[PDB]
Symmetry: C3
Subunit: 251 residues, 3 copies
């Protein structure tokens, strides 16, 4: 449940690299990891020498989503997800995701939150929420303004699995790259040429609409996420996945 | 002026297929057909065994649009168009268009309304509204949030004709397929794996913005659609098409 | 600081061609040029025989942006930019950009404002605003509703330079063409087949959202554009470009 911070003295550039390092649960979104990510962004922003952040990961999974009354707990998990995403969106620093592995559930919210997102040949993406009786409610806050409408409907509904070239095609990421590290380094160079003020303002232009969306919908989507989480359809839906069988609405 | 309903016992899956079957006017949007489509969606939703709907058609035309004071009539046609589209958008069921033939005018509103839309090698699309002195007013309710801005402006203005690969490119449909039936069956399988609640909620996430658009603009767009319909430019515009000549603003 | 007007008697079609003809400052947005562009659109609209406008240019640069208390001046430049873009968006006439050369800064606002934009093999595009301590504030009014979200974030932040095929890919222009004149002539033919009323209304459908954006943000973005312009980071940022060195936040 750890996030590694590496600043300009370590990166050798005007860049902070925050690396998700929780391989035991495949980088799941534990509260500890969340708080450490928050602290990472705080430290990054606090350093006048940093002009960009890279959100990297270890292991073959970028982020698999959350880990585990029930409703209160669920609605707070949703809220913390939202708060984190918002933290990324609100930052004066452009944030670049370096992805080379699987992304599921909340992982999507993280990717959507980053201003730039690059993904490599090992990556995979699947919105199987509906398959377990729920919906990608909270992650919609950063998914819906970046995905083409057709794509969002399609993958939300089909729950099918897709690669990096597809994710680029649909707006989920900025670009598919065979060498993620190289691509991200190039991007870091270019962005790094921007002035702190210029970059903050340029980003804020692009995030104003997103933040408007948070303001209007975040609490609503948290409460729905919880209602769904506690429902019986989701119970059966999760049991079926654990028991490795098919859920009772499908055979 | 008929729509065929085929339920799970007939489809052999958790799917209802509503097939537009009005070849005499090439599947035009008569009031009867409209009411029957409404009833089809009502029956589909009413069946707990149905988790998805396919909107299919017979003949080489998916939908050619409407068939035929004048203003009152026009504004009610517009309103009925809107109501139908809204019925599709509001449904708890994901709706998939299976298209393999021509789409014109209101047909566009139907395609735009579906959550997923697949189109085959026989398909064609043209927004010739401006050519006859009118505009695609009411269909904008589902076209504008799904088409890329450049595409919408372009084809709205040029009235040029395009194919399925292009329609996929611009957001008008989800995917171009050589074998529409196969593609749609695959999609039906995948979506069908979703839970009723999960699918309804996942869809509602994607349609909230659309429905907001209906709330704000539907009546406005109906009244404009009627004003345009009754205007003299549209009269001349329609006469010219009937008389098979060029309209008086073009040679 | 001149714009050439050529009407239907000259064009030989239902088209007015406004050609940016200010090669001494590579078609920069001087107030004179701005007023003449305004007058060009006014004359175009005034001519019942005109159904479309082409915004063309001479020289290898389409538009390089603006030319040159300080704050008052900056905020008025921003406001005039906005007013011009709005003039284009509000017009009853579809406006087509014919681009074959460089586009920078405000040039982007012009391209974004046109309903249709075609660009040739000589074209280049770069948002280096952040590089000089500023942001593409005012041009966001027409850029943000037409660019894919990922693209806008990327190029706003990286300031990297891109070509016509890329600009087409991201929504900045409608289409990349090897022969711009031919492409634009074809488009002009097709649009020209539209009725004046039909075209005005069809366009207004597509611009309603844009104009809403102007209403909400234009003044805000002007004031921010000025605050940025007068800041010290932008001073250093501009000096560095003039002195041909690297700015003090980059080496």
């Amino acid at each position: 449940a750890l996030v590694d911070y590496a600043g300009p003295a370590a990166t050798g550039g005007p860049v902070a690299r925050l690396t998700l390092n929780s391989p035991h649960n495949r980088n799941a979104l534990s509260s500890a990891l969340v708080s450490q990510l928050h602290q990472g962004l705080r430290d990054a922003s606090s350093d006048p020498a940093v002009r960009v952040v890279v959100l990297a990961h270890t292991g073959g999974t970028f982020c698999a989503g959350a880990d585990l009354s029930a409703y209160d707990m669920a609605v707070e998990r949703a809220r913390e997800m939202a708060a984190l995403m918002r933290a990324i969106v609100e930052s004066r620093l452009p944030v670049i995701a370096a992805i080379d592995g699987h992304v599921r559930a909340g992982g999507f919210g993280l990717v959507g939150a980053c201003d730039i997102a690059v993904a490599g040949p090992r990556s995979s993406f699947a919105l199987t929420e509906a398959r377990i009786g729920v919906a990608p409610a909270i992650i919609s806050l950063t998914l819906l303004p970046k995905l083409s409408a057709r794509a969002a409907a399609r993958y939300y509904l089909t729950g099918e699995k897709f690669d990096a070239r597809r994710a680029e095609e649909i707006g989920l990421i900025t670009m598919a790259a065979e060498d993620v590290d190289a691509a991200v380094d190039q991007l870091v160079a270019d962005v790094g040429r921007g002035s702190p003020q210029g970059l903050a303002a340029s980003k804020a232009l692009t995030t104003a609409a997103v933040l408007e969306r948070f303001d209007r919908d975040a609490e609503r989507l948290a409460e729905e996420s919880a209602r769904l989480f506690v429902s019986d359809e989701a119970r059966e839906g999760m049991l079926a996945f654990l028991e490795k069988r098919s859920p009772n609405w499908t055979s």
